[PDB]
Amino acid sequence: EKDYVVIIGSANIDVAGYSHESLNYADSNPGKIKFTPGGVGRNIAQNLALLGNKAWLLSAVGSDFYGQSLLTQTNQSGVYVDKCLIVPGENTSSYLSLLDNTGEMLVAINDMNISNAITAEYLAQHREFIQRAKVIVADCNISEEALAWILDNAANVPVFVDPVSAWKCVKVRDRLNQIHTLKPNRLEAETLSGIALSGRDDVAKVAAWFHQHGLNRLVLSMGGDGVYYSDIRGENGWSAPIKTNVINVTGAGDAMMAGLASCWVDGMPFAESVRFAQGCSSMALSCEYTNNPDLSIANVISLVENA
Amino acid sequence: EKDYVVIIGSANIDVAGYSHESLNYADSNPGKIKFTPGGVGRNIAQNLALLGNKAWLLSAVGSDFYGQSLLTQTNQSGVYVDKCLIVPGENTSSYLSLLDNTGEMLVAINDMNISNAITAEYLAQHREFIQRAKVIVADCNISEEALAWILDNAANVPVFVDPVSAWKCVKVRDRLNQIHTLKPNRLEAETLSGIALSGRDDVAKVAAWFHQHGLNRLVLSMGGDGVYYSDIRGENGWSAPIKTNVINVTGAGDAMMAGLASCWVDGMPFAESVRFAQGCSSMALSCEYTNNPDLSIANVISLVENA
Ligand SMILES: [K+]
Ligand SMILES: [K+]
């Protein structure tokens, strides 16, 4: 009772549609449409609840009914959504995705403007609660002002930051000294550091840069080459990817971030926390949904000790 | 007053997305996504509630949370959704729509399969309630078995039928003798009758065909030419379109159908009911949403006494 994690990020509705018999353009074509809960912050929060952590989501949804049902589904994942800001006169953010029979994304749209409602004033209304969490997880979907507020008011609570995308990660560059753990991929790390990752001989170089700019811990996902982890105190290593039957790649990074934060709270060492996080992402990859409902400590452990 | 109307049709979630700039295929492109309640039956029910009728919707939605929010949103329009079947283990039906800068339809997907959960057994569980309505409105999204059940068990309650599309209207052809009022467009009428509507000289013939196959009343929407109405007892005429600011064409027919049924309940003559229904369609056209929230008897009336 009372150890908890705060997750400040975006909460979305992911709508995935594919036509079943080819695409007759400029015509309604019969197919399959799915509404899944999405958004980096929300997804991470869910994975944290599934990993047995008391998780509070600090996000923004619309005054529309569908946002409130998003909050409801998330709440029945175990997540505490009671502090989520509901914005009047605005609509809940969403990720529209047009795929095909195979499952290859043809085109996609995103309406993530309400992420800007996650304002510094809002988190300031929860300052003390935030400062009494065991760890804070933030995604870079929020504004530069909001992230800056978080990093400036963390009161020595470790902030784990998900850089999200190559475009959205840049807001992190000048504040690496305020981040406990960053989890970029190849493109994000290259974009931040300004150093190309053509070979693995480059990762050290990249890591050095990060450490020179004040980053405490780096968790660099290199996809099939694996994960490179580096601690500013000198510990660094490679973790091979978990052999996984990949059916859907969505939700992988979210599960990884959740694994990292959860393991930090559980007092686990860096390397084994990374392996565990890889196990979480592995569970995410082997699932059709963004969040694998079978994500558990026991099953991730089982998956990991398979190797 | 415990006079009520029953609407048996589909309940959907319409998801409309358009990009702010030019669509870069195979990439997440920033835009705006809107979730509006849709589905011919549901929309008609809503317009009927807005026209001041106690309206009961008999539809099917999924066990997912978004379906329950669809039902809720509909309920706060005044519609009674308490008899709506909620189907376990499946997803609420939906209409995915990819638009562009202007608002021009690029592509569309539809997942309306749960419409066939609206079964004859389900309607049979509400047989007497259905048979005590002042009017039954049915759309052709339901299965032929379901429509057949309705028309066979109406107990002399007038059934107003919305043919929906050229593909789904055909299930009506052999049961025209069981329908009080049919509201087809040009294409639907041509598809049913097997007679082309190239000119105005053809509408009479089309009407004759319909009457010879047992249809009581025909309300033939001809778009810019207007509406041709025909009673099997010999009354027939033309009603010119109400000059309207076409902003969104969606929801026009739903508003028209609702107008027709509502006017029938209010004891209005055929022609004047058609004019009123046209006024409803005018209000629908003047709105960006599928349902104009300002749809009222007073406002439609004001609109119609304008010329
Ligand atoms: K997945
Ligand atoms: K409209």
- Other Cβ atoms less than 10 A from the Cβ of B248: the count is 16
Best interface-test mutation with A: which of B29, B35, B99 has the largest number of A CBs within 10 A?
Answer: B35
- Helix, coil or strand: residue A134: coil
Name the DSSP letter for residue B246.
Answer: -
Yes or no: say if A237 and A220 are a contact pair by the CB < 8 Å rule: no
The Cα diameter of chain A in Å comes to 60
Say how far apart CA A294 and CA A280 lie, in whole Å.
10
- Other Cβ atoms less than 10 A from the Cβ of B168: the count is 20
Rg, chain A, Cα only: 19
Query: Looking at domain B5-305, which of 3.40.1190.20, 3.30.70.260, 3.40.1160.10, 3.20.20.70 is its CATH number?
Result: 3.40.1190.20
Could you tell me where the DSSP H helices lie in A158-267?
A: 186-193, 203-212, 252-265
Ligand whose nearest atom lies closest to the CA of A247: 1
Q: Give contacts of A73 with chain B, Cβ < 8 Å.
A: 65
Residue type, A47: N
Tokens of residue B235, six digits: 């009354």
- Alpha carbon of B248 to ligand 2 centroid (Å): 4
Residue type, B103: G
Q: At what angle do helices A252-265 and A40-50 cross, to 10 degrees?
A: 50
Pairing of strands B135-139, B159-162: parallel
Best interface-test mutation with A: which of B12, B14, B28, B94 has the largest number of A CBs within 10 A?
Answer: B28
Q: Taking CB atoms and an 8 Å limit, are B98 and A98 in contact across chains? A: yes
CA contacts within 13 A on the Cβ side of B19: 14
**Size (chain B), residues:** 307
Q: How many contacts (CB atoms, under 8 Å) link A and B?
A: 119
CA A168: distance to chain centroid?
A: 13
Ligand whose nearest atom lies closest to the CA of B255: 2
Backbone φ and ψ for A144, nearest 5 degrees, come out as -60, -40
Question: A114 vs A58, A107, B32, CA distance in Å?
Answer: 13, 22, 11
> Resolution of the coordinates in A?
2.2
Tokens of residue A189, six digits: 């790390």
Q: Side by side, which strands form the sheet with A227-231?
A: A54-58, A4-8, A135-139, A159-162, A181-182, A217-221, A227-231, A236-239
A301: left (phi over 0), alpha (psi -120 to 50) or beta: alpha
- Alpha carbon of B288 to ligand 2 centroid (Å): 5
Yes or no: say if B127 and B149 are a contact pair by the CB < 8 Å rule: no
Residue type, B277: A
- Helix, coil or strand: residue A176: helix
Name every residue whose Cβ is closer than 8 Å to that of residue A194 and which is 6 or more positions away in sequence.
A209
Name the DSSP letter for residue B240.
Answer: P
Yes or no: say if B118 and B90 are a contact pair by the CB < 8 Å rule: no
Which member of B31, B72, B109 has the closest CB to residue A19?
A: B109
Residue type, B101: N
Torsion angle (degrees, nearest 10) of CA B241, B245, B250, B251: -60
Q: At what angle do helices A65-75 and A40-50 cross, to 10 degrees?
A: 30
- Alpha carbon of A210 to ligand 1 centroid (Å): 30
Yes or no: say if B51 and B296 are a contact pair by the CB < 8 Å rule: yes
Cα three-residue angle A195-A196-A200, rounded to 5 degrees: 110
Residue (of B152, B200, B209) closest to B182 by Cα position: B209
CA A286: distance to chain centroid?
A: 17
Say how far apart CA A70 and CA A54 lie, in whole Å.
19
Name the DSSP letter for residue B134.
Answer: S
Name every residue whose Cβ is closer than 8 Å to that of residue A178 and which is 6 or more positions away in sequence.
A151, A152, A154, A159, A214
Q: Taking CB atoms and an 8 Å limit, are A33 and B94 in contact across chains? A: yes
Give the bridge partners for A37, in sequence order: A13
- Helix, coil or strand: residue A151: helix
- Other Cβ atoms less than 10 A from the Cβ of B212: the count is 11
Tokens of residue A258, six digits: 């959740």
Say how far apart CA A303 and CA B10 lie, in whole Å.
44
Q: What share of chain A is helix, strand, coil (3-state, %, to 5)?
A: 35, 25, 40
Backbone φ and ψ for B20, nearest 5 degrees, come out as -75, -30
Say how far apart CA A101 and CA A168 lie, in whole Å.
31
Say how far apart CA A164 and CA A149 lie, in whole Å.
18
DSSP A270-285: HHHHHHHHHHHHHHHH
Say how far apart CA A69 and CA A76 lie, in whole Å.
10
Residue (of B85, B75, B73, B105) closest to B10 by Cα position: B85
CA of B42, closest CA in chain A: separation in Å?
A: 16
Say how far apart CA A14 and CA A215 lie, in whole Å.
32
DSSP A43-81: HHHHHHHHTT-EEEEE-EEESSHHHHHHHHHHHTTT-B-
Cα three-residue angle A198-A204-A210, rounded to 5 degrees: 100
- Alpha carbon of B281 to ligand 2 centroid (Å): 9
Best interface-test mutation with B: which of A65, A114, A164, A168 has the largest number of B CBs within 10 A?
Answer: A65
Ligand whose nearest atom lies closest to the CA of A245: 1
H/E stretch holding A253: helix A252-265
Tokens of residue B250, six digits: 């969606």
Q: Taking CB atoms and an 8 Å limit, are B34 and A91 in contact across chains? A: yes
Say how far apart CA A221 and CA B299 lie, in whole Å.
61
Give the residue from chain B lying closest to A95, CA to CA: B33
Say how far apart CA A195 and CA B32 lie, in whole Å.
35
Which member of B28, B32, B65 has the closest CB to residue A108?
A: B28
CA B2: distance to chain centroid?
A: 23
Tokens of residue A130, six digits: 């935030």
Ligand whose nearest atom lies closest to the CA of A248: 1
CA contacts within 13 A on the Cβ side of A246: 11
Tokens of residue B195, six digits: 């007679």
Could you tell me where the DSSP H helices lie in chain B?
A: 40-50, 65-75, 120-124, 127-131, 144-152, 186-193, 201-212, 252-265, 270-285, 297-304
Name the DSSP letter for residue B294.
Answer: T
Tokens of residue A187, six digits: 């493109």
